[PDB]
Amino acid sequence: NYGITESVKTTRSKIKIKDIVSDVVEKKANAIKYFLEGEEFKQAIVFGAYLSGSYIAYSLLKDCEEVIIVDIQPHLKDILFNDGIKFMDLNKLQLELRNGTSINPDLVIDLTGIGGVSPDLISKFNPKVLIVEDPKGNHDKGISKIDNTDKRLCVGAKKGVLKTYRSSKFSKTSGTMTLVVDIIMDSCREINELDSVLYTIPNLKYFEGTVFHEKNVKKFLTELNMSAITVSSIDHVEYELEEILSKNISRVDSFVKEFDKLA
Amino acid sequence: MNYGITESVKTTRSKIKIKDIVSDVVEKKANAIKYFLEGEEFKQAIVFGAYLSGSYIAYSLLKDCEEVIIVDIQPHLKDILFNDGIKFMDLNKLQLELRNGTSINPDLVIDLTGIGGVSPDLISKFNPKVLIVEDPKGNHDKGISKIDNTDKRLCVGAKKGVLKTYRSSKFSKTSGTMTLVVDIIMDSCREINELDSVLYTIPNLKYFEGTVFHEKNVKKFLTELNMSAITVSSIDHVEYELEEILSKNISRVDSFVKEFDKL
Amino acid sequence: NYGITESVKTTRSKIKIKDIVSDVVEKKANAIKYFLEGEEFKQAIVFGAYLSGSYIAYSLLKDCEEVIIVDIQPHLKDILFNDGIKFMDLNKLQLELRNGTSINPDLVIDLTGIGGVSPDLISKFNPKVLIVEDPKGNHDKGISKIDNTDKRLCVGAKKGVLKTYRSSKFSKTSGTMTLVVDIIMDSCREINELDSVLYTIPNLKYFEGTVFHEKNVKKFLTELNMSAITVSSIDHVEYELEEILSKNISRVDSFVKEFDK
Amino acid sequence: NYGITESVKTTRSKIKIKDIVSDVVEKKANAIKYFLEGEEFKQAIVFGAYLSGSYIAYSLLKDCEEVIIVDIQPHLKDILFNDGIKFMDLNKLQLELRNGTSINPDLVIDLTGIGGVSPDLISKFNPKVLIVEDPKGNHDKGISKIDNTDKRLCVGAKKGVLKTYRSSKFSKTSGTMTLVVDIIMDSCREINELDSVLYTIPNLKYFEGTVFHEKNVKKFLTELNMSAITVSSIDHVEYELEEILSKNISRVDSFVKEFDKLA
Ligand SMILES: Nc1ncnc2c1ncn2[C@@H]1O[C@H](CSCC[C@H](N)C(=O)O)[C@@H](O)[C@H]1O
Ligand SMILES: Nc1ncnc2c1ncn2[C@@H]1O[C@H](CSCC[C@H](N)C(=O)O)[C@@H](O)[C@H]1O
Ligand SMILES: Nc1ncnc2c1ncn2[C@@H]1O[C@H](CSCC[C@H](N)C(=O)O)[C@@H](O)[C@H]1O
Ligand SMILES: Nc1ncnc2c1ncn2[C@@H]1O[C@H](CSCC[C@H](N)C(=O)O)[C@@H](O)[C@H]1O
Ligand SMILES: Cc1c(O)cc(O)nc1CC(=O)O
């Protein structure tokens, strides 16, 4: 399409924010898959539905008979896309733990990160495998101080820490939201330098507010259908726009590092 | 300022709104013109290009100009004018009145249309005391220089001037108010993200130009500008630094009319 | 080609600082050539021997019968590589201008920039063509304040301003040195992001000091033979290193903008 | 000092490369000091004299009766400034281990990083404390692949990993040379943006080559006495130049992260 006049072009990227989220959640899910080495489980409990928790739970359905997503926010059941996954709010979980025997997972995954699940609640399980997502990205004193990932690695015969970074680029956290935003912002800066570009728009907003303040998952999902970037230019930049975004998405590297505990 | 996903993370929306950035930029352009005019009074001022800075620049000319007329190829842009003292004419109505009338004979002509805008031929039909042409070019870009014809538009007026707007020490592709606002926001984000404890920084941007020229909805566009320029997720307070970074980037904008002497 | 151990490689760029200087001076000389449209001159006077002036004077020898380089520093005669170019210091030029008739150029080119040639000295000529190099690059208030390029365009039937920028990149001035330094620095940042790179070294120093403080052109020319960049990496980066540098050299765009009457 | 004419000022930074090196080696030595909690040792063995190793060995003399620096390069004995530090080449250490009993350290520190000490040689010791310097900085696939820091933490009752990063900035390694170079380069970017600056020169060269190819420590030490940055500007920037460098040096954060065997 054209801009203000036919002398300027407007190009909306084919890559949408949801395609960026998808690629990142998938890398996290594949990092977990690789660490699990094809092991099968009777009951998997995943803490934290947003943002990568939903796909990671879907990915566990193949080798896990029962997959339970647990979240402190009951409205996050709406972020699950597959009915095979069971959703439990934190109160219902804690209630069932005390007055029941149905909760005894062999796989526990903590994806809550900063200010999330307490090591105390994790200590109530005895799984074969414990995976804790490390929210820390590149160095930041403020984030390191509030982080307690090591304290959460208190159960499981096998323990692992899910780490996610961008090769050659700086990111403050390993969070899917942070990574998507950083991939978009870095692509923007390089796209603006392409010949004939007037300006580059990253189609961003505080998406996290839609999910946790407005409590509207449906609206949040609609907001992710937006082109990641919109560019105003004199010449065609469509090909270079997709290449810069794809290259930045490809920088994402996710892996589970085994936390050695001999006893 | 509010909590994010949990009480361990804060969300800070900047006090500075996108409209405050737009306002500061348009005002710098209007003051650059004011300074160049040296208090000279005019009977009829014609301003080509209502969007984005033309609206305020026309309002600023009302003091020393008896009649101020905004001319735009888009008739719906009459909605971007905020003062009823500014007369609005579409390009057809102007061209018609020029041929079959004598009411159009301005002593002050201002072309703010930039890229793919007013033709030097239409400018040649006037004989003002002062001609000011806004140069859309920012920092060097071959694609933009090729399409630019600012020098060809400086064909009339006893006194000629070129309105130039740049960001001191920073790169911008154009002098456009939209380009500058976007670049100020993006550069502020880059620096804000480096503050200690910041997780991620969101520039609240979108293709605002599309709302004005594709959707043809000025009202919606104006509402979209009321949004905070930046939203930050952090562990610690960044509210004061967030405003300081933005203010410093807004201050980098330098607008001036360079006299194009001729005899 | 190994570093501290055989597990790390050291790669010195094939492109030398002199190759970057050469490419930038040639772009400036070609910008002037295109503006002159093949016009022939009897006497060309070029103010400012360092850094592009030397090559620009050499490039004028084809269409100019006499080419004179003028400079406030007499030792800069050493930066001229062709004996066909005549060298005069600023004092000798001013003396001859006042008490003589041998100086009456039809082509005047001012390349001194910041704190250089006075509009008063330029006003003493009546050439067919005048070219003033604009030292300003991208926007900077401090540099704009001290700049007086417009005041120097006071003579010549045809006037032009030599402008040089880097497309899509920020540079404070249009000066050859600054452009070489900025090309090197920007290449280094992108090279550091290549996979397996540990660190990237721009082989820079205050080269200007060797020329104007130490007053040693020979040493300065030897200093330019160094590789522009040295990289420590686990994997091969030879070709990417040359591609990033070449792309940054290619961003340089020089042109003479005609100043009407 | 002036430049080409008196209209331009040349400013050489008061901060020398050696001062930036000093701040980085000292932070590493203080990170180790803090981790050791004042514990005293009979024999400390430090692998890798260059670059931070020499000062780290000097810092251990207070609480260690015997401090031995071990290096694969015999000429690196020249980088040690204090005669109290005993120097042994790699061959001499391995020979004495097999045909002797004088080598039985209670403190082992591996600072060799990439392509350095083999876990096999580390396995030959039985110290009270083992500290392995992690050479990895922020994420890079190539560097992570060649890194084997975890495999080197095979001995010691107490294990620690010395990590060094730049808060909010990207660095490929934790190496003293990499950090100094990155601090200088980042300071240049910001210094170049100061008003009136024409250009900024980082006074860098391949210093590592002087030490390992030319095998001249003396020359290397002389090369570090140079000002870190030289700036050409119209106005005074002395105070800002030192402030930008100091702020970048301050971003360096070194710490030993404990690895608990719990056995
Ligand atoms: N104690 C707790 N128990 C269960 N869920 C929690 C929790 N504390 C926070 N959460 C939930 O966990 C999520 C924290 S955000 C996690 C981001 C995720 N690691 C990613 O990279 O996408 C939110 O859905 C929040 O509501
Ligand atoms: N030939 C013409 N005559 C009158 N108005 C025109 C025109 N071509 C474009 N325009 C109008 O001029 C504007 C071009 S956008 C101008 C951007 C402006 N310089 C700024 O910095 O804000 C739009 O309002 C457009 O509709
Ligand atoms: N008044 C004057 N007359 C003649 N030469 C001068 C002068 N003032 C300065 N110079 C010389 O002009 C040069 C200024 S350096 C300018 C940089 C050059 N435009 C480039 O891009 O390479 C120096 O060689 C200096 O000795
Ligand atoms: N197997 C080995 N045994 C002992 N020293 C070694 C070694 N391999 C390399 N070295 C030495 O250890 C140093 C590796 S350089 C590591 C850089 C250091 N971590 C810093 O940040 O300053 C060099 O001096 C090298 O000669
Ligand atoms: C990673 C992360 C987290 O674990 C908790 C929180 O509140 N915010 C983030 C940032 C993000 O979601 O990207």
Ligand SMILES: Cc1c(O)cc(O)nc1CC(=O)O
């Ligand atoms: C400057 C400018 C212009 O003159 C014409 C156009 O279509 N777009 C822009 C960019 C902008 O408005 O910022």
Ligand SMILES: Cc1c(O)cc(O)nc1CC(=O)O
């Ligand atoms: C451009 C320029 C100049 O006009 C005068 C001076 O002294 N230094 C420079 C910088 C440079 O040589 O690049």
Ligand SMILES: Cc1c(O)cc(O)nc1CC(=O)O
């Ligand atoms: C850290 C490091 C290392 O462990 C091995 C090597 O060859 N180079 C470096 C880089 C540096 O010294 O910064």
